[PDB]
Amino acid sequence: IHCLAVRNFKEAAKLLVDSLATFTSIELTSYESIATYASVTGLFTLERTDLKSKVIDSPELLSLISTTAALQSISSLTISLYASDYASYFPYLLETYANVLIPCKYLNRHADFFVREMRRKVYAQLLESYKTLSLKSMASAFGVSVAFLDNDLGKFIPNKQLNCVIDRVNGIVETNRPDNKNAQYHLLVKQGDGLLTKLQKYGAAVR
């Protein structure tokens, strides 16, 4: 529970997702309440390999889908993400955001902050599925508008979240190198200088 307020999504996916089948606390929390957050943190750290085992094919969530179908989280979002189909993935984003994220106290505090993580997940999956593709071809395939396509990719690419190349002359999108040797060493620059800052600052304080 405390991992949801501090925006963890990593260590919370190793507990609420993979666990025993009951965890009924009665007055505090219920079974359907804890099972709802399983699809929250499970879509961040767990890759597609664990989505088809501890999420989809997990017997704990199979009984909840046939019981309460109004969640539209552990079922609609997981099937659309596993199929990598943006056509059916879009309408399940607004339905889940309204009836799940907003009412819950530990969710609506994130809300669009958690929505930004789900959208960049499907854009990264399709990015590895092709090299060069026309913008009008993808617009007519998955049913996405051209005007709203530039605004979706404009909140990520400049932040170095996803590497993509788009040629507006021919209206095509390219694929950059997802992982490179220099990109890994750039993260060690801030981590290396971040440690040396504490060693120098706290070292001079005690003297």
């Binding site: 984003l93 607004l94 902050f113 930004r116 996405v144 508008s145 709203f148 605004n151």
Partner: peptide, 27 residues
């Protein structure tokens, strides 16, 4: 809170529902 909680979002609210307009018309 790096590049997230400071600027929040302030987007994708009324523009998300507006996408279904062009989807159910031009098609």
């Amino acid at each position: 809170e790096n590049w997230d909680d400071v600027e929040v979002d302030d987007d994708f609210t009324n523009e998300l529902k507006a996408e279904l307009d062009r989807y159910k018309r031009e098609n």
